[PDB]
Amino acid sequence: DPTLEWFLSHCHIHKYPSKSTLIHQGEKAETLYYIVKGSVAVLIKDEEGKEMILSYLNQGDFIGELGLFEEGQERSAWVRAKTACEVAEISYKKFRQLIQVNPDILMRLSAQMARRLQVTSEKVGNLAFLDVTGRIAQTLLNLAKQPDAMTHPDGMQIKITRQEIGQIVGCSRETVGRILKMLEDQNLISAHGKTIVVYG
Amino acid sequence: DPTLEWFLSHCHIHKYPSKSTLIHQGEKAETLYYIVKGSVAVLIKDEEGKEMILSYLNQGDFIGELGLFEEGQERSAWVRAKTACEVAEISYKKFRQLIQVNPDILMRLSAQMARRLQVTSEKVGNLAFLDVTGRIAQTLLNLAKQPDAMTHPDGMQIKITRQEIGQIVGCSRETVGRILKMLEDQNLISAHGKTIVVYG
DNA sequence: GTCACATTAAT
DNA sequence: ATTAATGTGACATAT
DNA sequence: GTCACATTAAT
DNA sequence: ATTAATGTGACATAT
Ligand SMILES: Nc1ncnc2c1ncn2[C@@H]1O[C@@H]2COP(=O)(O)O[C@H]2[C@H]1O
Ligand SMILES: Nc1ncnc2c1ncn2[C@@H]1O[C@@H]2COP(=O)(O)O[C@H]2[C@H]1O
Ligand SMILES: Nc1ncnc2c1ncn2[C@@H]1O[C@@H]2COP(=O)(O)O[C@H]2[C@H]1O
Ligand SMILES: Nc1ncnc2c1ncn2[C@@H]1O[C@@H]2COP(=O)(O)O[C@H]2[C@H]1O
C-alpha cells in the first residue's frame, strides 16, 4: 500500500519482546501505534485484578488510537505483546499533520475503529445472551478458524491455556476446565491439557 | 460550528416520530445519519427476540457510520427514536466527497467512534465483572446524572420502566423488580412504579 | 464462581 | 529447580 | 433467569 | 376500552 509505506516512513519502529506491555491503562495518550509484525492482546482489569481480553490485534492493526481525537485522554486499556512485536510508533501531533496532507490515512484508522465497535458490540451480546458454555463453545470455534490453527484428521487442533479462555469469556480457570470436560463428554472436542481438537 | 453547518448543508433532513425505527439491523448500509434534535436507542437482539440496549445517542451524534469504510456492509444494530427526531441524512458517497474537500468532518465522526469503543468496552467490563445488582446500581446513578433528571429533596428523581432497565443491564423485567426492591430496603433508592428517587 | 490444596506441566 | 498451570470436591448464591 | 397468572398503569 | 406494564411465589440451574 502506497499510503501505508508513506505513513510508516514518518514512524519510528520499536521492538518488544513477547509478554511485555506496550500500553499501560490510565496513562497519558500521546502516541499512536501500528503493528508491523507480531500480535498483542488488549485487556482490562477489575478493581481486584481479574482480567478480560477485549481483543487480539495483529500485523497491520493500529493501537493506541482512542486518545487521538481529544486532549488529555488516558489509555483505555492494557496492551501486551502476545508474540515478539515490531511496532511502528508516531506522536499524535505528527499523525494529525499527515491527516491534513492526506486524509486517507485517517480513513484506514477509522475503518478499524468501526470494525472494532462492531466486534466489541458483538461481545456485549455474547456476555448478555449466552451462558458460559455457549461463550466457550463459540470461542473454540473462532480459534479453530484462525491462521495459527493446526490441521488434524478429525477437525482442527488449537493450543491455549484454560486461564486465557477464562479471560476471554469471563469465568474462572476452574469453570473453563469443567466446561471443556463437558464438551468432551458430548464428543464435541477432545481436550488434553492445553491441546484442544475441535471436531468439525 | 463552521464545519457542521457546512456538512449539514449537504444533508437532507428527515423527521421521525417517537418509537419509530430509523435503522434496521441486517440491511444494506449506504447512508450516514446525524441527530439534529431528539434522542434514539441503539439495540441488538438475540435469536429469540431478547433486546439489549448498546447505547442511547442524542443531539449532535452521528448514526449509521459503521458501514462507511467498506462496501457491502450491513447495519450492525437497530436504531429507534426515543423521542421525536429530526435527523439529517446523506449518502456515504457524498460524505466521502466532503471528507476529501475537508477531512475535519471525518475527524468529528472518528471522535465519536473512539468514544463509542471506550464506552462499549466499559460495558463489556460491567457484564463480565459486576453482578446484576451492581449493573443496575450503576445504571441508576448514571440516569440520575443525566440532563432529563428531576431534582428532589433527597437526591434526584428519574422515570424509567423495569423493562428498559432489564434491557440495558441484561436481565428479566422480574429480576429488575426484585433488585429495585432490595435497593429500597437498603435505603439506597425509593421506587414507586416507574418513579425512582436515587438518594445522594 | 470461590476455596483449599493436591498434582503436574514448563522454562 | 522453581515457577506457571491445573485438577477437584465442597459450597453459597445469583441467574 | 423462567413460568403462570393475577393486578394494575397508560393511551 | 384495551394495550403496555407489573407484581409474585415456585422453581431449576448456572455462576
Ligand atoms: N474493544 C477494543 N477492541 C480493540 N482494541 C481496543 C479495544 N479497546 C481498546 N483497544 C485498544 O487498546 C488501546 C488502549 O489505549 P488507547 O485507549 O490509547 O487505544 C486503545 C485501542 O488501540
Ligand atoms: N467474571 C469473572 N470471574 C472470574 N474470573 C474472571 C472473570 N472475568 C474475567 N476473569 C479472568 O479470567 C481468568 C481465568 O483464569 P483465572 O481463574 O486464573 O482468573 C480469571 C480472571 O483473571
Ligand atoms: N456500541 C454502539 N454504541 C453506539 N452506537 C452504536 C453501537 N453499535 C452500533 N451503533 C450505531 O448503530 C448503528 C447501526 O447501523 P450501522 O452499523 O450502520 O451504524 C451503527 C452505529 O451508528
Ligand atoms: N440475559 C437476559 N435475560 C433476559 N432478558 C434479557 C437479557 N438480556 C436482555 N434482555 C432483555 O431485557 C428485557 C427486560 O424485560 P423483559 O423481561 O420484558 O425482556 C427482557 C429482554 O428483552
β-strand partners of A89: A12, A33
Q: How far is the CA of A25 from the centre of ligand 1 (A)?
A: 10
Beta bridge partners of A3: none
Grid cell digits, residue B164 = 428498559
Asked if A141 and A184 sit in the same domain, the reply is yes
Q: What is the tally of structural domains in chain B?
A: 2
For residue A160, count other CB atoms closer than 10 A to its CB. 15
Q: Does residue A79 line the site of ligand 1, with CB under 6 A?
A: yes
Ligand 3 atom nearest residue B65's Cα: 19
Enumerate residues 6+ apart whose C-beta is below 8 A from B4: B108
Ligand nearest to C-alpha A45: 2
Query: What is the B95 CA–ligand 3 centroid distance (Å)?
Result: 17
Same domain, B113 and B140: no
Tell me which residue range forms the domain holding A27: 2-130
Task: Please check whether residue A42 is in contact with residue A54, taking contact to mean a CB–CB distance below 8 angstroms.
Answer: yes
Which of B75, B110, B130 terminates a domain? The answer is B130
Exposed, middle or buried by CB within 10 Å (0-12, 13-18, 19+), for B193?
Answer: exposed
Residue A149 contacts B, CB cutoff 8 Å: no
Chain A residues whose beta carbon lies within 8 Å of the beta carbon of residue B175 = none
Distance CA B77, CA A141 (A): 24
Domain identity same for A84 and A106: yes
The CATH number covering residue A119 comes to 2.60.120.10
**Nearest-5° Cα angle at B55, A64 to B13:** 100
* Overall residue count recorded for chain A in this entry: 200
A109 shares a domain with A51:
yes
Q: How far from each other are the two terminal CA atoms of chain A, in whole angstroms?
A: 37
Indicate the residue type of B19. K
Alpha-carbon span B149 to B123, nearest angstrom: 22
Closest Cα of chain B to A69: distance in Å? 5
Q: In chain B, helix, strand, coil percent, each to 5?
A: 40, 30, 30
Verify that B81 and B179 share a domain, yes or no.
no
State whether the beta carbon of B119 lies less than 6 angstroms from ligand 1. Answer: no
Q: Which three cell numbers stand for residue A58?
A: 495483529
Q: For residue B113, give the nearest of A46, A50, A117 by CB distance.
A: A117
Classified as helix, coil or strand, B128 is helix
What is residue B74's DSSP assignment? Answer: B
Whether B106 sits inside 8 A of A109 (CB atoms) is no
Three-state SS annotation for chain A: CHHHHHHHCCCEEEEECCCCEEECCCCECCEEEEEEECCEEEEEECCCCCEEEEEEECCCCEECCCCCCCCCCECCCEEEECCCEEEEEEEHHHHHHHHHHCCHHHHHHHHHHHHHHHHHHHHHHHHHHCCHHHHHHHHHHHHCCCCCCEEECCEEEEECCHHHHHHHHCCCHHHHHHHHHHHHHCCCEEEECCEEEEEC
Choose one of B21, B32, B55 to mutate for the ligand 3 pocket test, by most ligand atoms within 8 angstroms of C-beta. Answer: B55
